[PDB]
Each structure stands twice: as C-alpha cells, then as structure tokens.
Design an enzyme around this catalytic site. Structure first.
Site, PDB file in Angstrom:
ATOM      1  N   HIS A 190       0.816  -1.214   0.000  1.00 61.53           N
ATOM      2  CA  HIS A 190       0.000   0.000   0.000  1.00 61.53           C
ATOM      3  C   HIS A 190       0.849   1.264   0.000  1.00 61.53           C
ATOM      4  O   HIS A 190       1.728   1.438   0.853  1.00 61.53           O
ATOM      5  CB  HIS A 190      -0.980   0.003   1.189  1.00 61.53           C
ATOM      6  CG  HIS A 190      -0.323  -0.216   2.517  1.00 61.53           C
ATOM      7  ND1 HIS A 190       0.061  -1.464   2.959  1.00 61.53           N
ATOM      8  CD2 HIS A 190      -0.001   0.650   3.508  1.00 61.53           C
ATOM      9  CE1 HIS A 190       0.601  -1.355   4.161  1.00 61.53           C
ATOM     10  NE2 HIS A 190       0.578  -0.083   4.516  1.00 61.53           N
ATOM     11  N   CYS A 200       8.637  18.681  15.316  1.00 65.76           N
ATOM     12  CA  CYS A 200       7.670  19.117  14.339  1.00 65.76           C
ATOM     13  C   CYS A 200       8.327  19.018  12.977  1.00 65.76           C
ATOM     14  O   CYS A 200       9.470  19.435  12.798  1.00 65.76           O
ATOM     15  CB  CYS A 200       7.245  20.547  14.617  1.00 65.76           C
ATOM     16  SG  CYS A 200       6.069  21.236  13.432  1.00 65.76           S
ATOM     17  N   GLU A 239       0.104  24.420  13.819  1.00 62.71           N
ATOM     18  CA  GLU A 239       0.739  24.472  12.509  1.00 62.71           C
ATOM     19  C   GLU A 239      -0.260  24.340  11.361  1.00 62.71           C
ATOM     20  O   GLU A 239      -0.124  25.002  10.324  1.00 62.71           O
ATOM     21  CB  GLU A 239       1.796  23.378  12.406  1.00 62.71           C
ATOM     22  CG  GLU A 239       3.034  23.643  13.229  1.00 62.71           C
ATOM     23  CD  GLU A 239       3.955  24.654  12.580  1.00 62.71           C
ATOM     24  OE1 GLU A 239       3.540  25.326  11.607  1.00 62.71           O
ATOM     25  OE2 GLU A 239       5.102  24.772  13.042  1.00 62.71           O
TER      26      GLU A 239
HETATM   27 ZN    ZN Z   1       6.150  23.453  14.210  1.00 58.09          ZN
END
Ligand code: ZN
Length: 202
Positions: A117, A170, A191
């Site tokens: 997949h 992040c 974000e």
């Molecule tokens: Zn960030």
C-alpha cells in the site's frame, strides 16, 4: 492469510464492495485509510497477486515498472480525484496549486499490513487516529520511503528500530517535544491552522 495484517486484502479482491474505495480498475485500488493519520489519508494498492505481497523495499529496488505505474496514477489519472478528496477533508477554498505542496506519497519501510500500500496523505498529521509516537515517526522519518527516493538512498532495514526512540519534533518547524506526544499534537494543530490561514487566499 488470516492475520489482521492481511485485512487490506478485501479492497483489492472486491473493491466494489467498500464505500471506502474511491477509485479502482483492473490494476489498482485507491481507498481511504480507516485510521487516517492526517486529515486526508489514502492508500493506493496494486491488485497484482504477485506484487501485493512483495516488500516495499524490494518493490523500490526491483519493480520499477510498478513504481512508475503508481506514480502515473498519483500524478496523472487520479490527481484531480486526490485534490478533490483533499478539499473535502481540508477546505473547498484550496487550489490544486496549494495542495500539491501539502501532500506526501510513499511506503513504510516496515509496513504493518501485508498487502502493498502506497500512502497518499496531507502533511498536517492532525487526526484523532494519530495516537502515538510510533505513528507520527513512521511518516516523518526515513521510515517513510518517499516514492521518488533513488534506490541508492533506500534506508537500511537493520537500522530502522532506532528512529522510534528519538524525541518528537515538528516536521514543519523542527521544534522538539521530548516524549510529550500530547504537546506535539497540540502544536501540529497550531501548525495546520497557520498553513490553512495562509493558503485559502491563494
Ligand atoms: Zn512546528
């Protein structure tokens, strides 16, 4: 093939049976992930019985025909379909222009489902079904093998375990959150709203 890891097999056998499937033909099936790890999270699956059980790293190395076919679907045939899905999941105000840079496409280096997949998903990782560090990391590190990765740059299988032990960071701005998955989740939401705010006027 009775493991829960074989559960995707139904989509390539009887794609006509599932509302989750948004496109199929004799060669591939595009289906919504039932536990989406971003606002939009789709899977493109080959229906070829001799390819579906081949490991994605072996696909990237030795089955370029299939790689090129998958890319042709994502970037050609199904592009409009995928953008429309993204607009349904994010905002109708978004252009293909803005979405193009907000989508990633690739395989897991150590998939958890046995049928091949290809992940097609937005970058946000804002989703209830993203529940642990392993989830997040599996999409934002070399464990996520981008479909355009040259063979020479494929990850080494042996070294794969070490990725899941590192502090969370992040993907957009690099701020780190230790093991505070909960803080990471709140930030990812921040974000996304920022990206969305900037992008809807474009
Ligand atoms: Zn960030």
């Amino acid at each position: 093939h009775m493991s829960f890891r074989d559960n995707l097999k139904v989509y390539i056998e009887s794609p006509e049976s599932y509302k989750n499937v948004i496109y199929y033909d004799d060669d591939v099936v595009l289906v919504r992930d039932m536990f989406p790890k971003s606002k939009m999270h789709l899977l493109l699956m080959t229906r070829d019985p001799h390819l579906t059980h081949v490991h994605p790293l072996e696909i990237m190395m030795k089955h370029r025909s299939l790689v090129e076919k998958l890319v042709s679907y994502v970037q050609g045939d199904l592009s409009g379909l995928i953008f429309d899905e993204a607009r349904n999941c994010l905002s109708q105000q978004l252009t293909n222009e803005a979405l193009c840079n907000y989508i990633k496409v690739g395989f897991h280096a150590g998939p958890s489902m046995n049928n091949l997949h290809l992940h097609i998903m937005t970058l946000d990782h804002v989703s209830p079904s993203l529940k642990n560090s392993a989830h997040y990391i599996s999409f934002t590190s070399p464990f996520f093998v981008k479909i355009d990765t040259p063979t020479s740059n494929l990850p080494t299988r042996g070294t794969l375990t070490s990725l899941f032990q590192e502090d969370l960071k992040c993907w957009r701005c690099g701020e780190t959150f230790g093991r505070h998955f909960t803080k990471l989740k709140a930030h990812l939401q921040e974000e996304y709203d920022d990206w969305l705010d900037k992008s809807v006027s474009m």
